[PDB]
Amino acid sequence: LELGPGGPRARTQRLLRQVDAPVLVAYCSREEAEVLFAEAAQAGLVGPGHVWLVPNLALGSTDAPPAAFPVGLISVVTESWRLSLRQKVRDGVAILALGAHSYRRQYGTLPAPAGDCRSHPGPVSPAREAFYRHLLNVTWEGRDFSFSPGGYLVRPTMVVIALNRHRLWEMVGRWDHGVLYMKYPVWPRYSTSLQPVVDS
Amino acid sequence: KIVNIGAVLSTRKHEQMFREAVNQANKRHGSWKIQLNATSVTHKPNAIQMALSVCEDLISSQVYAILVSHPPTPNDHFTPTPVSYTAGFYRIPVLGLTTRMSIYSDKSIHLSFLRTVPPYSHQSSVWFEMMRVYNWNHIILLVSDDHEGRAAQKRLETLLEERESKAEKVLQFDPGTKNVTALLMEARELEARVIILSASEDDAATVYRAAAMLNMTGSGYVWLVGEREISGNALRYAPDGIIGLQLINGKNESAHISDAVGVVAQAVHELLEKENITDPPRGCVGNTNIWKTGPLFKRVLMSSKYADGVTGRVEFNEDGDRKFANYSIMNLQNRKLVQVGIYNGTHVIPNDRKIIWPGGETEKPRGYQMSTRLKIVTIHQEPFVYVKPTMSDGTCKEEFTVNGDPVKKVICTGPNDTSPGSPRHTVPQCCYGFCIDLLIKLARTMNFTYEVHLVADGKFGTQERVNNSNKKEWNGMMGELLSGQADMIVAPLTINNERAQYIEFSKPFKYQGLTILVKKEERITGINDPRLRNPSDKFIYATVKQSSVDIYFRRQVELSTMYRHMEKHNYESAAEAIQAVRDNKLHAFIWDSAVLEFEASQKCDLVTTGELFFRSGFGIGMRKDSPWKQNVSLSILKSHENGFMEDLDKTWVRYQ
Numbered sequence: 001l002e003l004g005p006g007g008p009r010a011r012t013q014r015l016l017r018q019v020d021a022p023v024l025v026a027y028c029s030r031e032e033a034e035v036l037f038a039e040a041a042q043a044g045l046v047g048p049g050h051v052w053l054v055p056n057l058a059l060g061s062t063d064a065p066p067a068a069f070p071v072g073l074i075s076v077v078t079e080s081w082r083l084s085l086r087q088k089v090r091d092g093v094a095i096l097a098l099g100a101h102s103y104r105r106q107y108g109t110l111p112a113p114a115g116d117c118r119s120h121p122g123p124v125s126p127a128r129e130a131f132y133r134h135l136l137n138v139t140w141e142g143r144d145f146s147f148s149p150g151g152y153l154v155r156p157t158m159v160v161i162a163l164n165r166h167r168l169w170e171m172v173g174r175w176d177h178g179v180l181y182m183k184y185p186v187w188p189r190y191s192t193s194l195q196p197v198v199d200s
Numbered sequence: 201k202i203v204n205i206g207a208v209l210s211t212r213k214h215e216q217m218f219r220e221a222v223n224q225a226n227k228r229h230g231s232w233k234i235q236l237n238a239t240s241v242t243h244k245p246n247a248i249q250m251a252l253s254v255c256e257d258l259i260s261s262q263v264y265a266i267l268v269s270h271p272p273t274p275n276d277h278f279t280p281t282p283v284s285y286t287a288g289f290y291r292i293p294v295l296g297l298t299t300r301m302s303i304y305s306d307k308s309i310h311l312s313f314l315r316t317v318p319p320y321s322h323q324s325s326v327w328f329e330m331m332r333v334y335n336w337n338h339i340i341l342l343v344s345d346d347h348e349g350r351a352a353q354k355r356l357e358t359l360l361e362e363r364e365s366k367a368e369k370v371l372q373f374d375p376g377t378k379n380v381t382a383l384l385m386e387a388r389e390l391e392a393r394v395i396i397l398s399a400s401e402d403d404a405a406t407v408y409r410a411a412a413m414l415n416m417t418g419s420g421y422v423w424l425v426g427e428r429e430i431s432g433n434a435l436r437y438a439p440d441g442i443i444g445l446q447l448i449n450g451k452n453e454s455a456h457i458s459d460a461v462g463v464v465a466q467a468v469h470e471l472l473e474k475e476n477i478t479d480p481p482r483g484c485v486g487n488t489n490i491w492k493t494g495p496l497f498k499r500v501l502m503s504s505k506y507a508d509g510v511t512g513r514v515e516f517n518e519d520g521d522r523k524f525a526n527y528s529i530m531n532l533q534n535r536k537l538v539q540v541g542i543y544n545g546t547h548v549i550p551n552d553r554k555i556i557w558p559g560g561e562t563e564k565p566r567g568y569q570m571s572t573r574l575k576i577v578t579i580h581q582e583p584f585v586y587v588k589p590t591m592s593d594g595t596c597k598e599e600f601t602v603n604g605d606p607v608k609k610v611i612c613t614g615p616n617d618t619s620p621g622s623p624r625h626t627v628p629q630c631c632y633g634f635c636i637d638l639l640i641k642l643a644r645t646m647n648f649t650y651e652v653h654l655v656a657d658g659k660f661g662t663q664e665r666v667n668n669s670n671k672k673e674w675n676g677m678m679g680e681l682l683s684g685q686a687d688m689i690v691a692p693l694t695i696n697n698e699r700a701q702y703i704e705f706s707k708p709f710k711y712q713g714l715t716i717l718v719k720k721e722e723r724i725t726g727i728n729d730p731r732l733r734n735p736s737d738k739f740i741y742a743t744v745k746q747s748s749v750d751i752y753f754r755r756q757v758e759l760s761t762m763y764r765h766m767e768k769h770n771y772e773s774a775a776e777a778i779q780a781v782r783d784n785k786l787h788a789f790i791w792d793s794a795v796l797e798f799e800a801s802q803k804c805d806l807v808t809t810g811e812l813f814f815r816s817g818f819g820i821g822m823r824k825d826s827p828w829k830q831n832v833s834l835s836i837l838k839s840h841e842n843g844f845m846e847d848l849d850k851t852w853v854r855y856q
């Protein structure tokens with residue numbers, strides 16, 4: 001889809017009429033998410049018999065779900081999504097501190113801090129990738145924070161959240177690295193406003 | 201209205217020429233309603249300082265467009281990157297005219313960056329055309345470990361794969377490192393003779409040096425690289441008679457600037473006829489949101505096809521790249537590149553200087569070299585593969601059969617009874633028997649020389665996930681064949697779907713099935729006994745793990761419960777399970793027919809049961825690509841009508 005400002009609805013809505021799936025997965029931005037939610041609202045594919053999925057990118061504030069967001073949408077995020085910013089900062093500082101302390105345990109020295117902006121060191125300062133390696137494996141409060149070679153967190157513990165019947169975002173389940181848990185072995189398909197329907 | 205157009209240059213001459221080009225655009229279209237003005241900045245060695253200069257100079261004015269070129273010094277090839285991020289913060293379009301790196305080609309990080317010249321990765325496209333020129337297939341890929349190398353690899357593999365073709369193999373190397381010859385070693389003996397490569401100039405020089413000292417410049421061998429790999433020290437180390445790729449407009453930065461100004465003028469004039477035009481933010485500080493027409497400008501600049509290019513009609517691709525590229529192919533004859541072809545947007549026309557290939561010839565050599573010396577992998581199986589230690593002379597004591605003929609014994613190297621308790625020292629013992637007999641028969645039939653050795657791990661192999669549930673791959677002989685360690689599978693192997701999904705089989709040279717062995721009423725009734733129909737703990741039954749019957753029990757979902765028993769008692773070889781049954785440790789052993797009735801007729805202390813419920817064939821399985829498939833098929837069929845394996849059965853399995 002185009003989904004940009006002033007995008008031709010006929011080109012989009014026509015193909016939506018050509019869309020016949022009851023279960024969907026979508027990818028877009030949060031503004032594009034709002035636009036497509038409105039577009040499906042006039043398309044009628046928002047109905048209870050319809051399922052649509054989306055990654056974290058098209059989501060804004062979990063505490064601020066816009067009215068365009070339809071009820072029953074579900075995604076998965078980090079467990080720290082309910083932790084306040086202070087807790088996140090403390091955990092990050094703890095990760096850095098434990099990495100530095102592991103560097104000291106292996107060698108007994110503080111990690112060399114970086115320089116200023118009017119120059120740029122060429123070599124990688126082998127102590128620095130030693131610190132990086134000791135930072136590649138982080139565990140705190142039982143939650144591992146070992147990162148990936150791709151520069152991000154690898155093998156994390158995720159929580160699956162779903163918008164509730166009161167337009168509230170709440171967690172339905174948890175993916176613990178090999179195991180799935182989730183409430184509601186059936187999904188309440190509210191009658192486009194409320195009152196989930198019993199499947200025949 | 202005045203619109204500012206920005207440039208990033210360090211020449212002090214192309215700056216004034218860019219101003220003159222802005223004036224020329226004004227002459228071509230007119231700036232009475234919408235005045236046009238130019239602005240030039242100088243890229244600096246310090247990335248932070250030049251980014252600050254861009255922020256406080258080019259953003260301090262509501263500049264609608266910006267372009268960049270490379271500095272003469274090869275230091276900081278990614279100089280435009282801070283400019284790209286600065287434009288991205290407000291999502292501003294940016295043009296790079298001189299970059300050849302696919303890093304900038306990414307639009308997930310560089311949203312509105314456009315590049316006139318395609319990167320070195322797009323160079324890949326011409327090699328595909330080269331493949332069409334010479335009707336070649338035996339492609340060997342060599343590439344650096346850098347992101348540019350991986351991107352080029354992906355592009356070229358896509359290009360070769362839409363034609364249902366696949367690269368024979370791919371090799372990756374760490375840039376700047378040495379001792380690459382060893383890597384070249386494991387690529388040296390492959391049957392292919394045409395080569396492709398992707399690296400940097402110093403890496404190109406290193407590999408040129410290695411190939412020269414490895415005699416890789418001989419006949420048949422040939423390869424092709426980009427401009428940077430045939431320049432400077434790389435050109436110095438390059439051999440003569442090597443082919444090379446050249447840009448039509450590699451070094452004329454002025455032409456790039458002219459065409460860029462023209463296309464920018466076209467795009468901006470198409471913009472000004474529209475409404476809701478938002479001025480770009482003035483100054484980084486005080487503005488922290490998106491620019492609205494920025495994405496609009498990129499949308500109308502994808503659609504901008506600039507015909508008045510000095511280098512011709514400039515049409516951007518889906519990703520802002522000039523389509524239908526203009527290249528040339530030279531030949532490095534006597535330390536100079538000489539014209540051998542011109543690449544127009546989709547094909548090549550040769551003109552003169554007939555290609556003098558590195559082997560010293562002027563006629564096109566086939567990019568292939570069939571090997572008479574072939575690799576053979578096997579697994580120990582006494583009725584079909586007899587393995588015995590050799591004595592001091594390097595061989596083992598040969599003996600003559602009852603008929604008086606000697607048994608033909610080949611030198612097979614095995615890691616001293618491969619096991620954790622084995623030192624893994626691969627001693628050359630002697631192998632002989634049925635399979636060896638038929639190998640030597642078909643070999644002298646096809647005259648091809650052979651190298652025989654059993655499998656390293658001693659296991660058949662199955663499609664299994666890589667360690668921590670990563671992608672599926674083959675173990676055992678299928679592993680060595682999908683990797684190329686051997687050429688055919690010479691063993692009483694069981695044909696099946698998944699092997700056929702990756703390997704192929706000839707017509708089966710033997711017909712066989714499955715049955716059970718026990719010791720010495722209590723007759724286990726074949727397969728339909730609730731003793732086995734219903735899994736029972738008191739009764740023990742298993743097979744060899746990573747084998748065909750494993751796949752049998754896996755596909756038979758209703759039998760999965762018995763498969764659950766498999767997980768407890770699966771063996772690794774036949775002999776130890778045979779001893780366990782003779783020791784009554786194992787109640788019953790399911791396995792293939794032929795071996796099993798052979799053992800029953802020989803030892804007579806154990807009894808077989810159950811019919812050959814799974815009809816199957818022992819056939820020569822090997823790679824889909826190689827031509828020996830039909831040849832070996834017809835040869836073994838001719839032996840069948842000749843009853844040669846009947847004589848072999850009389851020699852080995854019958855009369856017991």
Ligand SMILES: *[C@@H]1O[C@H](CO)[C@@H](O[C@@H]2O[C@H](CO)[C@@H](O)[C@H](O)[C@H]2NC(C)=O)[C@H](O)[C@H]1NC(C)=O
Pocket residue numbers: 452454455456458510
């Ligand atoms: C570099 O490119 C510029 C174009 O920007 C060339 O200048 C013109 O090139 C055309 C092509 O033959 C000539 O017909 C014009 O007479 C040239 N004009 C001027 C003012 O020179 C320039 O010749 C190119 N130079 C090199 C070395 O490639």
Ligand SMILES: *[C@@H]1O[C@H](CO)[C@@H](O)[C@H](O)[C@H]1NC(C)=O
Pocket residue numbers: 102133134137
């Ligand atoms: C982290 O990994 C490094 C090796 O890269 C190892 O030396 C160190 O002991 C590890 N520490 C932890 C807590 O795993």
Ligand SMILES: *[C@@H]1O[C@H](CO)[C@@H](O)[C@H](O)[C@H]1NC(C)=O
Pocket residue numbers: 413414415
């Ligand atoms: C190169 O020289 C000859 C000719 O091929 C060959 O015998 C020799 O082994 C080769 N040496 C290397 C290092 O490849």
Ligand SMILES: *[C@@H]1O[C@H](CO)[C@@H](O)[C@H](O)[C@H]1NC(C)=O
Pocket residue numbers: 511512513514525526544545
């Ligand atoms: C590419 O080649 C064509 C054919 O020779 C020639 O017109 C010019 O060099 C290039 N064309 C364009 C449109 O760039």
Ligand SMILES: *[C@@H]1O[C@H](CO)[C@@H](O)[C@H](O)[C@H]1NC(C)=O
Pocket residue numbers: 542543544545546547548549
């Ligand atoms: C591009 O050049 C080729 C030959 O190099 C020639 O077929 C034609 O001029 C162009 N290709 C096509 C498909 O038109």
Ligand SMILES: *[C@@H]1O[C@H](CO)[C@@H](O)[C@H](O)[C@H]1NC(C)=O
Pocket residue numbers: 572644645646647648649
């Ligand atoms: C010998 O082998 C070569 C290549 O393997 C083949 O071309 C030739 O026909 C063979 N000759 C005989 C008599 O088998």
